Design a protein around this nucleic acid. Structure first.
Ligand SMILES: [Mg+2]
Ligand SMILES: [Mg+2]
Ligand SMILES: [Mg+2]
Ligand SMILES: [Mg+2]
Ligand SMILES: [Mg+2]
Ligand SMILES: [Mg+2]
Ligand SMILES: [Mg+2]
Ligand SMILES: [Mg+2]
Ligand SMILES: [Mg+2]
Ligand SMILES: [Mg+2]
Ligand SMILES: [Mg+2]
Ligand SMILES: [Mg+2]
Ligand SMILES: [Mg+2]
Ligand SMILES: [Mg+2]
Ligand SMILES: [Mg+2]
Ligand SMILES: [Mg+2]
Ligand SMILES: [Mg+2]
Ligand SMILES: [Mg+2]
Ligand SMILES: [Mg+2]
Ligand SMILES: [Mg+2]
Ligand SMILES: [Mg+2]
Ligand SMILES: [Mg+2]
Ligand SMILES: [Mg+2]
Ligand SMILES: [Mg+2]
Ligand SMILES: [Mg+2]
Ligand SMILES: [Mg+2]
Ligand SMILES: [Mg+2]
Ligand SMILES: [Mg+2]
Ligand SMILES: [Mg+2]
Ligand SMILES: [Mg+2]
Ligand SMILES: [Mg+2]
Ligand SMILES: [Mg+2]
Ligand SMILES: [Mg+2]
Ligand SMILES: [Mg+2]
Ligand SMILES: [Mg+2]
Ligand SMILES: [Mg+2]
Ligand SMILES: [Mg+2]
Ligand SMILES: [Mg+2]
Ligand SMILES: [Mg+2]
Ligand SMILES: [Mg+2]
Ligand SMILES: [Mg+2]
Ligand SMILES: [Mg+2]
Ligand SMILES: [Mg+2]
Ligand SMILES: [Mg+2]
Ligand SMILES: [Mg+2]
Ligand SMILES: [Mg+2]
Ligand SMILES: [Mg+2]
Ligand SMILES: [Mg+2]
Ligand SMILES: [Mg+2]
Ligand SMILES: [Mg+2]
Ligand SMILES: [Mg+2]
Ligand SMILES: [Mg+2]
Ligand SMILES: [Mg+2]
Ligand SMILES: [Mg+2]
Ligand SMILES: [Mg+2]
Ligand SMILES: [Mg+2]
Ligand SMILES: [Mg+2]
Ligand SMILES: [Mg+2]
Ligand SMILES: [Mg+2]
Ligand SMILES: [Mg+2]
Ligand SMILES: [Mg+2]
Ligand SMILES: [Mg+2]
Ligand SMILES: [Mg+2]
Ligand SMILES: [Mg+2]
Ligand SMILES: [Mg+2]
Ligand SMILES: [Mg+2]
Ligand SMILES: [Mg+2]
Ligand SMILES: [Mg+2]
Ligand SMILES: [Mg+2]
Ligand SMILES: [Mg+2]
Ligand SMILES: [Mg+2]
Ligand SMILES: [Mg+2]
Ligand SMILES: [Mg+2]
Ligand SMILES: [Mg+2]
Ligand SMILES: [Mg+2]
Ligand SMILES: [Mg+2]
Ligand SMILES: [Mg+2]
Ligand SMILES: [Mg+2]
Ligand SMILES: [Mg+2]
Ligand SMILES: [Mg+2]
Ligand SMILES: [Mg+2]
Ligand SMILES: [Mg+2]
Ligand SMILES: [Mg+2]
Ligand SMILES: [Mg+2]
Ligand SMILES: [Mg+2]
Ligand SMILES: [Mg+2]
Ligand SMILES: [Mg+2]
Ligand SMILES: [Mg+2]
Ligand SMILES: [Mg+2]
Ligand SMILES: [Mg+2]
Ligand SMILES: [Mg+2]
Ligand SMILES: [Mg+2]
Ligand SMILES: [Mg+2]
Ligand SMILES: [Mg+2]
Ligand SMILES: [Mg+2]
Ligand SMILES: [Mg+2]
Ligand SMILES: [Mg+2]
Ligand SMILES: [Mg+2]
Ligand SMILES: [Mg+2]
Ligand SMILES: [Mg+2]
Ligand SMILES: [Mg+2]
Ligand SMILES: [Mg+2]
Ligand SMILES: [Mg+2]
Ligand SMILES: [Mg+2]
Ligand SMILES: [Mg+2]
Ligand SMILES: [Mg+2]
Ligand SMILES: [Mg+2]
Ligand SMILES: [Mg+2]
Ligand SMILES: [Mg+2]
Ligand SMILES: [Mg+2]
Ligand SMILES: [Mg+2]
Ligand SMILES: [Mg+2]
Ligand SMILES: [Mg+2]
Ligand SMILES: [Mg+2]
Ligand SMILES: [Mg+2]
Ligand SMILES: [Mg+2]
Ligand SMILES: [Mg+2]
Ligand SMILES: [Mg+2]
Ligand SMILES: [Mg+2]
Ligand SMILES: [Mg+2]
Ligand SMILES: [Mg+2]
Ligand SMILES: [Mg+2]
Ligand SMILES: [Mg+2]
Ligand SMILES: [Mg+2]
Ligand SMILES: [Mg+2]
Lengths: 209, 148
RNA sequence: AAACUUUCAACAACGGAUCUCUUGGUUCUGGCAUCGAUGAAGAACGCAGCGAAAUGCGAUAAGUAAUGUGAAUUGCAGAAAAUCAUCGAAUCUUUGAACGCACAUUGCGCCCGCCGGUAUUCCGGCGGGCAUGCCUGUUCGAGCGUCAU
RNA sequence: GUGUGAAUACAAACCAUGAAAGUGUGGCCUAUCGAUCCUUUAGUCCCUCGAAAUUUGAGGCUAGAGGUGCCAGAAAAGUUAC
RNA sequence: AUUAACGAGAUUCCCACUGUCCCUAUCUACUAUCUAGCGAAACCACAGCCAAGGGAACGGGCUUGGCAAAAUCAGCGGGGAAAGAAGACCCUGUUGAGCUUGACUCUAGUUUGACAUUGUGAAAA
RNA sequence: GCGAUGGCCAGAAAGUGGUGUUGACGCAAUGUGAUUUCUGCCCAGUGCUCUGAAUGUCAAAGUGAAGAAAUUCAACCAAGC
RNA sequence: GUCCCACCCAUACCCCGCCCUCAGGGUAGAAACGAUGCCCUGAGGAGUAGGCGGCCGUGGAGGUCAGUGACGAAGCCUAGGGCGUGAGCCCGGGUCGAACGGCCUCUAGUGCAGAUCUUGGUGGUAGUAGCAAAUACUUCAAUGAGAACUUGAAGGACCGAAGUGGGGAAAGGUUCCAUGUGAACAGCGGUUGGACAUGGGUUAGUCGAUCCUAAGCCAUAGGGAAGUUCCGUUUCAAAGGGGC
RNA sequence: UUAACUGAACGUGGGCAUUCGAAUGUAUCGACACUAGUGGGCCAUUUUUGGUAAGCAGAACUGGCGAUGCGGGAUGAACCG
RNA sequence: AGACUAAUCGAACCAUCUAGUAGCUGGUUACCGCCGAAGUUUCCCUCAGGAUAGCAGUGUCGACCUUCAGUUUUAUGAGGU
RNA sequence: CCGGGACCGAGGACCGCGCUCUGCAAGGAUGCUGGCGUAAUGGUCACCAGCGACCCGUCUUGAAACACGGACCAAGGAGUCAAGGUUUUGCGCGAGUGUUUGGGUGUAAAACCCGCACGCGUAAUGAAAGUGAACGUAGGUGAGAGCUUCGGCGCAUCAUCGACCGAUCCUGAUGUAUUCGGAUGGAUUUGAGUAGGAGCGUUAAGCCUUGGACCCGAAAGAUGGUGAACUAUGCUUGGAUAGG
RNA sequence: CCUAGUAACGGCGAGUGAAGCGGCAACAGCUCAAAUUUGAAAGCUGGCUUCGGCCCGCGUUGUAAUUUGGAGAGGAUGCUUUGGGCGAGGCUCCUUCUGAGUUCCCUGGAACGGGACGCCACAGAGGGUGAGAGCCCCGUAUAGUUGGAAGCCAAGCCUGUGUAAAGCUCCUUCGACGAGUCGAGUAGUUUGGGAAUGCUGCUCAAAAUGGGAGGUAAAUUUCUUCUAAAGCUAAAUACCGGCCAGAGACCGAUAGCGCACAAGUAGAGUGAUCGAAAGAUGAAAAGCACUUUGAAAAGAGGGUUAAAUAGCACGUGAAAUUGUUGAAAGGGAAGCGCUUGUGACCAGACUUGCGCCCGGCGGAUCAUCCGGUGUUCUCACCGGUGCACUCCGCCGGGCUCAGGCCA
């Protein structure tokens, strides 16, 4: 029963909500458990980094179109261009995504360069120490300062384009002939009227016979 | 805290400030928004005009990302430039260079024209632009270019 | 004036409040994944030198073996560890999903083997067996369902 | 000083009537009436059907109508002497 | 409608009979009573003499009068608007339930039609 | 009311069940209530029962028409009325 | 009835003291001040429902008081005091035996006369109602601290064979027997007891169960049911026993 | 708007007081925010309406009781103070 | 006979949903200080209840502006008791 | 102008108005004297006396009520917590703000540190497509605290006339994919807008909603189980009922 | 976490209500059907076996190898790839072991209290011991160490070898891909899903660049995106039910679980079920020997103890209610307020303190000066001086001032 100038209440507590309350008194203990699990898995992956190499990926929608992030895995085309065999990639710390495609040369080239840098920085120990093969690090460059976090050492260098840039005057581009606002109005109108104009044009073309 | 509440002051006084005639019963008038078109109509009409009825059309499966186009005014357009470079431009230590501002990088899609602009050329890259904003940029001596 | 009633006080009663205590609850957090036809959970009945209960145990019955510790247990008695810890070897009555058929009966059977009574057949004692659904395999079969001689 | 019903003066228009001035926004004045939801009409180079078009269909925006007489507006028969 | 017989059924009258009564009296046993022993409960704001007045219009208390002397036993049924039991009569509640129906809304069953189960023939325009 | 391919009834269903180890002198459902003497008139109403044409009403399925199709419109109808 | 004089007293009026509230001022070249203090002045004070402010008290937490305490903490009793308007606070005396308090913050399961409130305890009633159906007891003796209701003897009585007799079924479970007995129970008593305690007592080929089938119940084969399970009991089943 | 600067409305500039144009009071002016309880009333003077009337029922103004003690009316919610 | 179905019957008993809902009855716990009501308006299946306005408290803020007034006087309107 | 009596003595150097001016009765009591120095005064308790005084809580117009609850005492006993909202306090930062989903770290549920995103705010309006806020020193007029060089400058805020943005109605230019585009200026219109940002987080209080929701209380409704030892009816198998 | 109380649903009322993107935690990929091994069923269960194999059976109505759409199959092409065994060393696990007062004095029954003097501390967490114990005892901190089992990981070594198998680079061609299934209609239910979101029943019933989806029903034309009707798979997530463990601004015997106890017990009900009350002597039983009265229970003495009014009706021991003793009142209630009176019983105040003269006693600073320090830099302190017409204190006398109660 409202009695004054109140915002209309819509608190969804008409079910037995107390039966499903989730408190979080275990937040610090769960954090401790997570840290212990991370330390254990890092120790298990003794010289290797604790994660897999991920590609750069552009977020889908028109919102977030401007930002890049880490994807799931590298495509077969990216691996082939980088020269890394498909069966060999997941065994040396590279994530592989078979269902992503490279629709653009820009993304393809960026991910290929990323893979090439990773391969250049990779140290590959031989399967057996007493008989190394030609594809392994030959025991001399096997000592170096390594990284155990590929998410930081191979992160997104710049998710967004630089918002500020300086150009000299007389290099200022000439504007759109009718103006940007008019250009947007014209493009909108053309998109609206594409079908009606098409049917009218074909009707006028066929009116002769 | 319980020691600051008025129930402590009501100790020793029968009815706890709820009155003797009206007795603080369970739910006189109903629960929630009962009687909106009835005994509570006076309240629901004095406040909240327009509580009842339908207006407008429906949009099944509305995806809010389609309508993402935050706007920034030309009065705060210059606040997007770093403070030292902005001060250099405003004092006039360039006058041979122009700043190129990426509204999409800063998180904006449309440029609006609320404020004024100093007479300094500036290139603005925006998805959308208002007519007044475009006119004001052109009069300041710059240009807006559409970038998607 | 006593008695009686009432009031006040001291002491004594009745009762178990108050104070203090707490081998108990309650709540949160962390670790772990391990019941049963190789018979579980649960139930019954028994077991101690002197126990009714609780706890423990199963006719090897307040427990046996084994390992560790190292001198008790204790209410009394007794004796030459322990009502100790641990626990990998055993025992584990009648039951119970409960399994020969039953069961409101400590009821009634069948099979194998041994030991006695003159005994393949009856009686007695002892031991081991006899549920259902389904799977794989084995063997023995049924059907003009069907194939050759 | 919320609706509803009524009512009063003026502006936009384009009409009626009188030579005019003027009068006329229903009945000389005081009564003669009706929300949300739904539906049906009227209105336009109007908006949407959200991958893109055309045509059906549907949905919106503005103004009326279909009604709640318990008339600020639930959808509603009795009996109990058990 | 009548009806013999039957009836711990309802009703009127008659004979007999009697304490139902005129109109009460008396007797017996067991209580009550007193004692030894044992030993509750209901109920209880505080309590307990009235008259009138006023007052929530029927006072134990208030006002004004009458009055008024310890502690007690057996009876008693005027009063305590005495004790039971949150009135069952009546009304209210946007509280029920049992039952009824041509109330509103449904429903088991049932009836009929269609599709499927459902195949193989012939004949009739 | 019923002659078993049934009547009345039970069941969530059933290769289910009761009546039924039954068959009209039986089973089932009602009313009145020994014997005696009788039990009159009324079928408009509500039921029940019987016929559904010269008659009207109707769903799904099916048929025809229009449509580009969704659909719309027409005829046809079993039971029930 | 009218007129006159004096007198009586409300928490009202007037003067004074004090409390609080409200209002208006003063107070730093600080010899200065719980400045949230002090000093000066004026007015005002009813109150249910209700609002606000300030304070008192309780359990627990942080800081602090170099806090109190077996030479006596807490609690409890007190016709012994002091302070505060008040809720309350402090002290004296007694009892007692192990913890506790003040100050500033923090915190709450924080303040009772009621709710036919909850649990527990205890009154008046009150030594009161009452312990009155089933005919009934008496004498002597023994026992014993104690005898109407223990026992022996005698007398008087009842049940009067559809019994107050003698045995069983259900049900009970040791109540049966012996010995002993303080309390409790036997609505009086009690030496007595179906009570309490310590020990004993139930012997079957023939009496029953066990065997048989009845009404009926549960399986099986099958069929239903999401399933717990329902029907089914001979039914649409390849379902057994006799000899050499 | 008028025939017209001729009006209407709003102003610029200048002037008024040798006296801001009745009385009394000012023991309080205005705006805002958030919210409690209440939404059974009853009594009295005067004016009344219905009723034979009622310690009856219903209204207007004001004052009271409710919410309020104190003196008086012996006794009292409202009367007098 | 609405009888009986374990002292329970116009729908047994047990546990749970369940602390079911109640515009209705009862109760609702220290002190002091200051302020201090309403039973009326409009709407409501509204009439023992709500919302709404009023009455009340608290907190402020504004120049607390030289204004305000349940009053008189003067001047000037309206009314049909 | 003279008497007679009662109650009272607030304040605490001077300061001031003054007078009858070596002083005073003038901005509040001093002087002298006596008894006692303790239960004498005074406090507490018990009782008598004069006057006064109905039983509390509650509902109610009205209670001491012949209205209800209360025999008595001890202990327990009723506006809580969470989410969301709002206004007002106090804080931090401020066109920004919010570390604690998470990561790093640790003396390990603390404290400390980190950042991408995200929420709210910074822009509204319309059903929507969409469009989207300066003529003026961010306007004019009247007030307006405070400053002022005394001429005016004018905060907050109020009233008022304008300007800008969106929507709705009008028109309707240059143009043309000839059916699209919508310039210009005009509305008795309209918006929770602009017109030199105030918000975000947090703390406390009142209030609101949902929740058991201040505490106790229905008649009912539903789901799943347990009973025919009483009783009802029936089936199977038994038993019993003088004398006339 | 956010999206978001949003889109949407709803007598559009009450109310209900997701998802994509985005940040993070955790990340893991795979195998069947659909192919002829066809120059050799190459596969598997069971039994026997010296270990080499044998036999039966399953299976061609298809058990192995190859292939799973990310492809693959077939060809070229040149490179590249692989099996076993140790294993220092480290992390685990079990096990042995851990610093310092019981020193002196007082109180006490008992120091674990108070005072004095010491010590240890990577240990001053906790508990016990006759009262608050770091050093009396168990434990507590730290990495170590005694002995042992061998669970894991692992630097690096030792040693087979390309018949076979495996990857990559290019390619004309080929390129099998799940049916009463999808889909459609209708009905019911469900969802935010709205001309129908999922699920199910019934009816109809597919196709091969086909099919599904693309949140408004339909026809037509495009586009995008995946590839159903077969299958497996850590982690991040839920949960205190089970077994262990650590904690708390929680409760403290009417509280906290119903249960701190022989509690799911005693007891009730035919049954399903219902379901309590009940902790504390003392450090130690030292749990009262013995005498006496009594039939006994018990009493009175006496004893134990720090204490028996701590005596198994046991820590403390309130109120209601009761008994005795003492005081008082009472002519149909009592209680209570204001005010005296009587009686009883009491708290305070006071019994001095200030000054000034006159004597006595004692002391050594009292002014001043010198030096050294401090400090507020001019005010003190400490030493040396002083040395009695100073200064201080204590007695005796006199005087002054004030100070209690009632007048
Ligand atoms: Mg609920
Ligand atoms: Mg009050
Ligand atoms: Mg109340
Ligand atoms: Mg109310
Ligand atoms: Mg006692
Ligand atoms: Mg066993
Ligand atoms: Mg067996
Ligand atoms: Mg077996
Ligand atoms: Mg038998
Ligand atoms: Mg033999
Ligand atoms: Mg065989
Ligand atoms: Mg054969
Ligand atoms: Mg209408
Ligand atoms: Mg309608
Ligand atoms: Mg479209
Ligand atoms: Mg309508
Ligand atoms: Mg109405
Ligand atoms: Mg007759
Ligand atoms: Mg009598
Ligand atoms: Mg007697
Ligand atoms: Mg009494
Ligand atoms: Mg009388
Ligand atoms: Mg009277
Ligand atoms: Mg009375
Ligand atoms: Mg008398
Ligand atoms: Mg009598
Ligand atoms: Mg009487
Ligand atoms: Mg009475
Ligand atoms: Mg009643
Ligand atoms: Mg009503
Ligand atoms: Mg009903
Ligand atoms: Mg009923
Ligand atoms: Mg008939
Ligand atoms: Mg007829
Ligand atoms: Mg007829
Ligand atoms: Mg027909
Ligand atoms: Mg005063
Ligand atoms: Mg007051
Ligand atoms: Mg607490
Ligand atoms: Mg003490
Ligand atoms: Mg002690
Ligand atoms: Mg409480
Ligand atoms: Mg109480
Ligand atoms: Mg009270
Ligand atoms: Mg008697
Ligand atoms: Mg009697
Ligand atoms: Mg007698
Ligand atoms: Mg007798
Ligand atoms: Mg003798
Ligand atoms: Mg006798
Ligand atoms: Mg006889
Ligand atoms: Mg006989
Ligand atoms: Mg016998
Ligand atoms: Mg017998
Ligand atoms: Mg029997
Ligand atoms: Mg004997
Ligand atoms: Mg007796
Ligand atoms: Mg006796
Ligand atoms: Mg005896
Ligand atoms: Mg004897
Ligand atoms: Mg016995
Ligand atoms: Mg026999
Ligand atoms: Mg036998
Ligand atoms: Mg069966
Ligand atoms: Mg079957
Ligand atoms: Mg109302
Ligand atoms: Mg209101
Ligand atoms: Mg009334
Ligand atoms: Mg009311
Ligand atoms: Mg009246
Ligand atoms: Mg009232
Ligand atoms: Mg008054
Ligand atoms: Mg009076
Ligand atoms: Mg009847
Ligand atoms: Mg029963
Ligand atoms: Mg009965
Ligand atoms: Mg029932
Ligand atoms: Mg029940
Ligand atoms: Mg007042
Ligand atoms: Mg209505
Ligand atoms: Mg009422
Ligand atoms: Mg007239
Ligand atoms: Mg008139
Ligand atoms: Mg005196
Ligand atoms: Mg009196
Ligand atoms: Mg009344
Ligand atoms: Mg009262
Ligand atoms: Mg009365
Ligand atoms: Mg009443
Ligand atoms: Mg009542
Ligand atoms: Mg009573
Ligand atoms: Mg307690
Ligand atoms: Mg209490
Ligand atoms: Mg409640
Ligand atoms: Mg609430
Ligand atoms: Mg209830
Ligand atoms: Mg019920
Ligand atoms: Mg219902
Ligand atoms: Mg049931
Ligand atoms: Mg029976
Ligand atoms: Mg006979
Ligand atoms: Mg829906
Ligand atoms: Mg829902
Ligand atoms: Mg040690
Ligand atoms: Mg000593
Ligand atoms: Mg010491
Ligand atoms: Mg210690
Ligand atoms: Mg597939
Ligand atoms: Mg459907
Ligand atoms: Mg369902
Ligand atoms: Mg659906
Ligand atoms: Mg679409
Ligand atoms: Mg894609
Ligand atoms: Mg699949
Ligand atoms: Mg799976
Ligand atoms: Mg308890
Ligand atoms: Mg207790
Ligand atoms: Mg309990
Ligand atoms: Mg029982
Ligand atoms: Mg005790
Ligand atoms: Mg004592
Ligand atoms: Mg003691
Ligand atoms: Mg004691
Ligand atoms: Mg007492
Ligand atoms: Mg006195």
């Amino acid at each position: 029963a409202i009695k004054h100038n109140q915002q209309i209440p819509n608190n969804h507590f008409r079910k037995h909500w107390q039966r499903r309350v989730r408190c979080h008194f275990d937040q610090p203990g769960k954090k401790v458990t997570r840290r212990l699990a991370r330390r254990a898995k890092a120790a298990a992956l003794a010289p290797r980094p604790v994660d897999k190499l991920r590609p750069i990926v552009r977020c889908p929608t028109v919102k977030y179109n401007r930002r890049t992030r880490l994807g799931r895995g590298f495509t077969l085309e990216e691996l082939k261009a980088a020269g890394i065999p498909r069966l060999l990639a997941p065994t040396i710390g590279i994530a592989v995504d078979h269902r992503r495609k490279n629709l653009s040369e820009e993304s393809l080239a960026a991910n290929v360069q990323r893979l090439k840098d990773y391969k250049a920085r990779l140290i590959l120990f031989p399967r057996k120490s007493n008989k190394p093969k030609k594809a392994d690090t030959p025991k001399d460059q096997q000592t170096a300062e390594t990284t155990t976090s590929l998410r930081t050492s191979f992160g997104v260098e710049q998710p967004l384009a630089p918002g500020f840039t300086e150009i000299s005057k007389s290099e200022i581009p000439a504007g759109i002939e009718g103006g940007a606002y008019r250009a947007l109005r014209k493009a909108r109108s053309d998109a609206r009227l594409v079908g009606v104009r098409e049917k009218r044009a074909k009707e006028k073309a066929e009116a002769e016979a | 805290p319980t020691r600051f509440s008025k129930t402590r002051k009501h100790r020793g006084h029968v009815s706890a400030g709820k009155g003797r005639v009206g007795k603080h019963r369970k739910h006189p008038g109903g629960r929630g928004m009962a009687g909106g078109q009835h005994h509570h109509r006076t309240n629901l009409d004095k406040y909240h005009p327009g509580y009842f009825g339908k207006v407008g059309m429906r949009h099944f499966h509305l995806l809010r990302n389609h309508y993402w186009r935050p706007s920034i005014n030309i009065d705060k357009l210059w606040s997007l430039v770093p403070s030292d470079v902005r001060e250099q431009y405003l004092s006039g230590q360039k006058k041979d260079t122009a700043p190129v501002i990426d509204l999409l990088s800063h998180g904006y899609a449309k440029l609006l024209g609320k404020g004024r602009l100093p007479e300094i050329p500036v290139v603005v890259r925006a998805r959308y632009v208002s007519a007044e904003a475009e006119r004001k940029v052109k009069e300041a001596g710059g240009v807006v270019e559409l970038v998607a």
